[PDB]
């Protein structure tokens, strides 16, 4: 009785320690995801720079060769 | 028995919570995995830019060379 | 009474094993996620290289202006 | 106590295995945070590339337009 009550309350404590540790891993993933949010729409910037550079190549080739 | 039965109920609840916590964690990883896809998809376009930018450099540098010397 | 107590504990043993398997599967997904970052890192190098290159050509254009 | 004590010991050992599994997850997450740093910073470098590549284009357009008319 005494040894098992002592064990059960350890388990409740151990489980809640695990819980906090899981929730803390969740927050680390949130932080990581929100930091990647500004980068998500920057494929179009890269695309526009590729167009510019491609247009300059085309303009060069036209006006000279 | 009563102190055992109450501490067991707390443990059921603690275990119920942990299941929910693991699933919230699973879901937040899915969302992270999703956030990286559009960044992975910038591969092709970055390589395009790399070729076309290098091609503009080679051609226009030559022209700054002849204008200056 | 006592029969409810023993199988509720068994229920928790099975529950905790499934959590364990779920945590180990999370870890598996994190390795896989890491491995896949290598090409995105490399894209970053190219981006860094192209920036320094474009900065370098602006500088070269300016020196001619500073000269004659 | 018979059935209860032997279930408890399994539950105690399972809760102990869980701690180790959670810790291995923290390790792998620390390494994932480390590997994501350069990617978290490339948004900045993309923006700086935007303005320096834009500056290169506008200025080299002039160089070539001057070269065309002369």
UniProtKB/Swiss-Prot annotation, chain B:
Residues 12-63 are annotated as: Homooligomerization. It comes from the Viruses. Phosphorylated by host IKBKE. Phosphorylation contributes to efficient viral replication and transcription. Ubiquitinated by host TRIM6 to facilitate virus replication. Residues 13-41 form a coiled coil. It is found in: Virion; Host cytoplasm. Plays an essential role in viral RNA synthesis and also a role in suppressing innate immune signaling. Acts as a polymerase cofactor in the RNA polymerase transcription and replication complexes. Serves as nucleoprotein/NP monomer chaperone prior to the formation of the large oligomeric RNA-bound complexes. Regulates RNA synthesis by modulating NP-RNA interactions and interacting with DYNLL1. VP35-NP interaction controls the switch between RNA-bound NP and free NP and thus the switch between genome replication and genome packaging into the nucleocapsid. The interferon inhibitory domain (IID) binds dsRNA. Belongs to the filoviridae polymerase cofactor VP35 family. Homodimer. Homooligomer; via the coiled coil domain. Interacts with nucleoprotein NP and polymerase L; VP35 bridges L and NP and allows the formation of the polymerase complex. Also interacts with VP30; this interaction is regulated by VP30 phosphorylation. Interacts with host IKBKE and TBK1; the interactions lead to inhibition of cellular antiviral response by blocking necessary interactions of IKBKE and TBK1 with their substrate IRF3. This is Polymerase cofactor VP35. The chain holds residues 72 to 134 of 329 of the full protein.
UniProtKB/Swiss-Prot annotation, chain C:
Residues 13-64 are annotated as: Homooligomerization. Phosphorylated by host IKBKE. Phosphorylation contributes to efficient viral replication and transcription. It is found in: Virion; Host cytoplasm. Residues 14-42 form a coiled coil. It comes from the Viruses. The interferon inhibitory domain (IID) binds dsRNA. Plays an essential role in viral RNA synthesis and also a role in suppressing innate immune signaling. Acts as a polymerase cofactor in the RNA polymerase transcription and replication complexes. Serves as nucleoprotein/NP monomer chaperone prior to the formation of the large oligomeric RNA-bound complexes. Regulates RNA synthesis by modulating NP-RNA interactions and interacting with DYNLL1. VP35-NP interaction controls the switch between RNA-bound NP and free NP and thus the switch between genome replication and genome packaging into the nucleocapsid. Homodimer. Homooligomer; via the coiled coil domain. Interacts with nucleoprotein NP and polymerase L; VP35 bridges L and NP and allows the formation of the polymerase complex. Also interacts with VP30; this interaction is regulated by VP30 phosphorylation. Interacts with host IKBKE and TBK1; the interactions lead to inhibition of cellular antiviral response by blocking necessary interactions of IKBKE and TBK1 with their substrate IRF3. Belongs to the filoviridae polymerase cofactor VP35 family. This is Polymerase cofactor VP35. The gene is VP35. The chain holds residues 72 to 134 of 329 of the full protein.
């Amino acid at each position: 009785l005494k040894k098992v009550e002592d064990t059960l309350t350890m388990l409740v404590n151990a489980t809640s320690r695990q819980n906090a540790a899981i929730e803390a891993l969740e927050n680390r993933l949130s932080t990581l995801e929100s930091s990647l949010k500004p980068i998500q729409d920057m494929g179009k910037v890269i695309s526009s720079l590729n167009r510019s550079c491609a247009e300059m190549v085309a303009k060069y080739d036209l006006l000279e060769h």
